[model samples]
Target: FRESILNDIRKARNLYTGKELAAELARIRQRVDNIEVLTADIVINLLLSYRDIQDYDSIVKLVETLEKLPTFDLASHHHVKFHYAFALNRRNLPGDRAKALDIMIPMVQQVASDMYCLVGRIYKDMFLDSNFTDTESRDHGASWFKKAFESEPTLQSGINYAVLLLAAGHSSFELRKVGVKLSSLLGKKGNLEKLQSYWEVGFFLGASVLANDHMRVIQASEKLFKLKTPAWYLKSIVETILIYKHFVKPVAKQELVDFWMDFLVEATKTDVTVVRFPVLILEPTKIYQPSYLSINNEVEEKTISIWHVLPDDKKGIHEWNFSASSVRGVSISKFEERCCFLYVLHNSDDFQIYFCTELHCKKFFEMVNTITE
Candidate 1:
């Protein structure tokens, strides 16, 4: 029976797509479960197949079941331990996340390993999800990521570490010294997404933006779909400025006056703090005039109010203001010519705010680019 099961598993690999592979993997798992006696080889293959796919969610229950078998020891195998630890962290069951932390604490202390780097990303992810109450966990997670980055400064480890820092409301002043080095690496990673430095350069370059490296920031802003507004980017800067204001030094500056000469782009000007929950309403009739747009909101409400403010200067364009019910979050996707997208973050039952014309779409995103810049 075990021999036959092995053959069945091998045959299933012919299917490459995710849907097909998952179906066969499930069947193999069930058949082994029904067997009263199972060999070490058969069970190991089953667990490994799940890990190989990076399908962390599916094998979480399988991990609990593995303890029943006496033949294999999970403690000795770093890869398998990672599989188990990763699943535990991801499942979000009662105390499994805490259980995962226990497993990971010692694991991250070892010599440089891919497992450690992976856990660094995991710990950082949890830190971002956590709110104010879990500061201890956030700090603990941050230390692990730092160790992971030190273990190896490869792209995965480096960027993942940077992300962890930014998410946890921390910054590496060390980043301020890496401008020339990272600039060189940026060219070192030309169009090679698979290279280890590619991800490192991509992620680390964003950090320079916050440090007032305008060249990289301007370049990044040109790519709308690529740059995401980090949950803590603006907040961290504001916090650092307030807490360390005395320690901060001002840069000596002179008027650019177009920096000798430069073409100006029309963009919205606003304070970053004013963008808590974006609620831009669109008016279809006024789109062509470069100032008007309309949006259709379909969420529930206790009250609704709308107002318009007329511009009194030559530089001012048309702008509208409105208010609505509370929402969890918001996501705006770039559509440029077709129609820009604005919808509440998460869930399928939602509405979209479509600008009237392609020009209106461009103008709206111009405002987005300006603020993000």
Candidate 2:
């Protein structure tokens, strides 16, 4: 049965093509019966990979096939259903989206209501939020976030809520009050410990929201770097430094940036590789384009260099990536070595300059430089 199912899948892959391929896949799916759990798992994985590739129509067809499976487990069924709804919404198929919501609502209510369900509801609510002009969907999203927080009480949900509130242009005092509440719930010691776990990433995010003194923010961030910084952390640090530059005063801003950079670089050289090992071991296979910002006079002339060691067959090798540019005269370079990734930022007098040493870092830097110039 397994071999036959695998053969069918291979055939389905070859038979399916463009435009009308979704319909062709549907026809093939109709023949699928007595499907084993392993076959179902393989089908689920294939559908998800297709979704990742943005093959929306194929995903839709695969979901249809999944729905027709004779015996679908709750977990796998719900997984496919969620993705189907997600894809339908992305495709702007309002009718299909509504249908998905109708199916999901009852299924969600029947579940044991764990954090997974809470997050799933949050994702669904994000779709609803985009479609509805009314406050209903927005409020629903907020409610799900609240439920997620109550279930796990992790720093993740707490910071997410805080960020949402901040983006809504909730007043600083109001946002600070939320921060205070978060701080109280998390407590200083507990929050610090949690920040320690994520290290700089946590500190960078936490500092952006939490209303604490500069020393407190610096201490939290430095602690993370001291433990171990990841490639992702270097990116976060660069962003955090930029944010700090925007919001904080000049001298203080540079001081904070220098403090964290110095600490991270020194920590990386230390032999105590147990707990504080850098997090950039594996090269990142994916890249996400950053959102927001533009060419501005203030961000134009800054430059930065990031240095780190890449893992090789025997031992790690050292490498440095640098970025430098200027619009009028302002300097914007801040060097950082966190984990195994290095990021350098040079804000030109008229544009912000940034670069990293990762998979396509050099190509991306050239592309950005070409556009900015």
Candidate 3:
């Protein structure tokens, strides 16, 4: 029974389409619960299937269950421990970061590059949460990424370290220094061609974006499409774009942003609905209630809200074709007649508020209200 279950999990990972992948992976939850015996590979495969579907809650619970199994020895399984911390961090609930940190910090001495990279990622999320204001977390995150890069120096870790350095407001000279080094690594006889995976290419793309190298960004972006990359990887690339746009020095170039945004719009035309979230810039200092907008296109409704909080997280967009009859009686009103701040009225007492820059708010209102009419 366990052998067949593992076989299903591996096949689920290999499945290309999201519908088939999710359907195949959904079986793991029930099979996992009934299994009285567990091993490292069994647990790992189960976690991988959940992770592929972005099922963070399931990942958190599976690892938590693994911990409670009296016979299971988690210490020797480094990958399991890493995934445990990874799920906790990705779950991103209250106290989750702290719990993830607690699990990984002690392993720093025993582990190598990936562990350091994960630590850096957890702290990076905290830094993003603080709106890049918490110097301590930013320093911790960059330091760990630095260590990770130095340990492995792969494009993945190297680009992460360099990009995080930019977000932490490092000097342009410092960024240039890293960019020059990364360029060397990607040059002739270097590892970029040696590794040559989607991640390596994506990181190179990210590094280019941060350096304002539009030519390389366009080249790598096209290569990604040719490779037929997955949505989660696209999500990382989107996050890299956000770091360049909002956090990096001297401001991101308008042309570069336009190109990437257009690229994302084109990506949605494929079978990939990668950018399910809209990019919105909020009032940085204001704390608002949890509100959401339900957007109904011709086929289905997708509900999304502002997940950007005290420290902002990056969200992106995919084009949706709206049908006239899909939504009814939807009206938008300005908040206190304030410019660039608007809300959607669903009922007498229920509304979803949106706070964005003047330009974006106007564009959004125009496009959406056009649909409402």
Stretches of candidate 2 off by over 4 Å are 1-38, 47-58, 70-76, 86-92, 95-100, 110-134, 163-181, 184-251, 254-373
Q: Model 1: per-residue lDDT, tens digit, 1-373?
A: 8898887777765443245677888878788888877655675566556654546676677666666667656566655666677667656677877777677668755476466655554555455445334555555655665665566544344434444445445435544433334445455565323423323333433443334555443343322212322212322222222222222232221112111001011112122222212222343443211122333233543212222222223374334333232233234554433245433334344324333223344554555443333
Q: What's the TM-score of each model vs. the native?
A: 0.48, 0.42, 0.66
Q: How much lDDT does candidate 3 score? A: 0.61
Report every candidate's CA lDDT.
Answer: 0.45, 0.44, 0.61
lDDT per residue (tens digit) for residues 244-270 in model 3: 577654334444445445554433332
Better of 1 and 3 by TM-score: 3
- Candidate 2 residues 211-251, lDDT tens each? 54455555555455445344323432443233223333254
Candidate 1: worst 10 consecutive residues by lDDT?
Answer: 257-266
Clash count for each candidate, listed in order shown: 5, 18, 2
User: Model 3: runs farther than 4 Å from truth?
Assistant: 16-20, 171-174, 188-196, 250-257, 261-373
lDDT of 3 at 297: 46
Top TM-score hit: 3
